Amino acid sequence: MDRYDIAIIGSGPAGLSAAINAVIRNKKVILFGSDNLSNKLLKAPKINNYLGIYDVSGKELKEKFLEHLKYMNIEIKNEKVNSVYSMGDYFALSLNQKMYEATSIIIASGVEFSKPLNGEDELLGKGVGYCATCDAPLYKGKTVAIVGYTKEAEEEANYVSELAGKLYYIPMYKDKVSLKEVIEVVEDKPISILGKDKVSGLQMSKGEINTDAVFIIKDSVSPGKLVPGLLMNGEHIAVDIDMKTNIEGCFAAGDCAGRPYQYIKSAGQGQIAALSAVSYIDKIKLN
Amino acid sequence: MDRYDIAIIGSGPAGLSAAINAVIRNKKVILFGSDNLSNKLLKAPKINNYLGIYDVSGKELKEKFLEHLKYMNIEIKNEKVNSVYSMGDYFALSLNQKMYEATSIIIASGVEFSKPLNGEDELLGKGVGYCATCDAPLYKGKTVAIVGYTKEAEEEANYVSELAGKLYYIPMYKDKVSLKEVIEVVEDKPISILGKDKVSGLQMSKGEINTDAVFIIKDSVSPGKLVPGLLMNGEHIAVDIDMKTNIEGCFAAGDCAGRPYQYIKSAGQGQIAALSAVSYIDKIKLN
Ligand SMILES: Cc1cc2nc3c(=O)[nH]c(=O)nc-3n(C[C@H](O)[C@H](O)[C@H](O)COP(=O)(O)OP(=O)(O)OC[C@H]3O[C@@H](n4cnc5c(N)ncnc54)[C@H](O)[C@@H]3O)c2cc1C
Ligand SMILES: Cc1cc2nc3c(=O)[nH]c(=O)nc-3n(C[C@H](O)[C@H](O)[C@H](O)COP(=O)(O)OP(=O)(O)OC[C@H]3O[C@@H](n4cnc5c(N)ncnc54)[C@H](O)[C@@H]3O)c2cc1C
To answer: Where does FAD bind (chains A, B) (predicted)?
Structure first.
């Protein structure tokens, strides 16, 4: 019922800069993402290319960002947006068992280095999912595999382990996992998701595992899948100089809007996107 | 003789972010501008829209920028670039009695709120100039008028006063001037620069003053005049998503590249422009 002026999908520097600039402009904003902001921030050892803050690690830089947000009284909604559809003069954002409305949206979701697997596109919705928490009630007691591209997937696996019967976890990183002992860790490369009507198993380089469900856990999903109808230029959202996309009222910023992948470029684009959204909102009210 | 990899025209956040990113990438950079960085920084009372540094005045923000530059061992050349011409596979930058060469250039000069006067374009070079120091040797002992749009013009007027015979100073701001007593301050609006073959006087709303020279002192000049052959979109340089202009090896960033006029947008574009210049330089060496 309550409708936000701007919904911002992503909590890296693009989304945070967008949120601060929109709030400064008296708009009602909702900011989706992670309390950690971005795992790519957390990873960086020393950063000397963000003008005005130098010789800082990514963790120190994240803290400065967090302090700014709290000064501005901006809260991050720790929920993952699964899809966005236009409904005419607003957008409907769908999350696990929850929907929000916003007049405009800013996509600030970053990019994913890895490329999907064979069968992810075909099986999506047919045993394949990107949120294992939302789909954990389905296939309860069944056999589940989680392909974890981020450390947070481990947390989802530990919860899923209690509903499902037999859980496999495939880590896509070298850091040792912290999982309940009953979870079977498979240290192998996934190749393809098997099944015709529904997923029947997970094909790996060293073997095949029969499974009811395969959950794919990454820090983001492709914008063209998040927002059907959004025009892409290869791996990136097509944008103009004002960060406008082909969808009216939909703007983009940061890595998801193209190379170079850098923090202050992302913050600058987030500010452009926010000010374009402000202009759009104002024009919509007049007409 | 010595040729720089990148020449950056401007020392606001766009130019500074460009310089830091180019140096981080092992390029030989020259950075032109002001030790004060930008008068627009110095003016701002409180700034809460630059992600990571909050509740700061423009002077505090300028100091953080200066500290970063010194950490990176980057020096600002306090000279005003008057023109840039291509010479084939490099650019020639002309200053008062000095020239530099660079393989690529980044225009980061900001924008000027005021619009020129009648006769500025026609008389330019014929008694009209934008640097009163470079043109002070000419018309020595003659009658000079300076139209000052910035406080630094006062400093130029105090020097010019000693060569010229009779100097008028027209302030375009309300702050009281600090000038040698022999300088005649005219508190009136300039309308037009008079003359046919050469400037003959300065027409004001309340009267006309006969003069040999009219010097127009602003924080920047239009990019289309700085770099003849550069394509403009109205008041701004035409750029693409990679900050490329119509001139190969010439990039732009910040206010001069379009609205919104904001600090972190400018810093982000400066970073894009620097990384585009790095790519260009590398491609030029291979071919
Ligand atoms: C190791 C490393 C070091 C680096 N060092 C530097 C450096 O020194 N300097 C530099 O300039 N750049 C550096 N980078 C690159 C920099 O991290 C990125 O350019 C920058 O983080 C891009 O930020 P962003 O806001 O576009 O997206 P991200 O930082 O990726 O933030 C996106 C956030 O939004 C979340 N999100 C995505 N989709 C959704 C959804 N549907 N719902 C809810 N939340 C979602 C993501 O989980 C993520 O938390 C480095 C990158 C790496 C990997
Ligand atoms: C009063 C005020 C308050 C503001 N507050 C805010 C705010 O809170 N937040 C915000 O985001 N933005 C704010 N802005 C806008 C912000 O200042 C600009 O968007 C930003 O400074 C643009 O920076 P830039 O690097 O593009 O150019 P500038 O900041 O204009 O820097 C250009 C510099 O390069 C120099 N230069 C130009 N041409 C030449 C040449 N040929 N040779 C040598 N040097 C040259 C100029 O003299 C100048 O020093 C404010 C502006 C004003 C006027």
So the answer is: 11, 14, 49, 81, 255, 262-263
What is the distance between the alpha carbons of residues A217 and A205, in angstroms, rounded to a whole number? 20
Q: Are A104 and A32 in contact (CB under 8 A)?
A: no
Cβ atoms of residues A217 and A210 within 8 Å: no
Gap from CA of B141 to ligand 1 centroid (Å): 62
**Could you identify the atom of ligand 2 that is nearest to the CA of residue B46?**
8
Alpha carbons within 13 angstroms on the beta-carbon side of residue B264 total: 33
Distance from CA of A32 to the nearest CA of B (A): 17
**Is B49 in contact with A24 (Cβ distance < 8 A)?**
yes
Residue with tokens 């061992």: B73
Q: Does A232 touch chain B (CB under 8 A)?
A: no
Amino acid, res. A141: G
CA angle B219–B225–B230, rounded 5-degree value: 120
The answer to whether the CB of A255 is under 6 A from ligand 1 is yes
**A49 interface with B at CB cutoff 8 Å:** yes
What was the elucidation method? X-ray
Judged by CB atoms closer than 8 Å, whether chains meet at B264 and A275 is answered as no
CATH number at residue B70: 3.50.50.60
Range of the domain at B269: 1-112+220-287
Residues B123 and B24 in one domain: no
User: Which residues are paired to B203 by β-bridges?
Assistant: B192, B208
For residues B18 and B95, membership in a common domain is answered with yes
Ligand 2 pocket residue status of B90, Cβ below 6 Å: no
Query: Which 8-state DSSP code applies to residue B255?
Result: G
Resolution as reported, in Å: 1.6
Write the residue in B20, B48, B51 that is nearest to A267 by C-beta. B51
Q: Could you say which of A181, A200, A219 is where a domain stops?
A: A219
Indicate if B67 and B158 belong to the same structural domain: no
* Interface residue B64 vs chain A (CB under 8 A): yes
Q: Where are the beta strands (DSSP E) in A87-207?
A: 91-95, 98-107, 128-129, 144-148, 167-171, 184-185, 190-195, 199-204
Angle made by CA atoms B97, B102, B107, in degrees to the nearest 5? 90
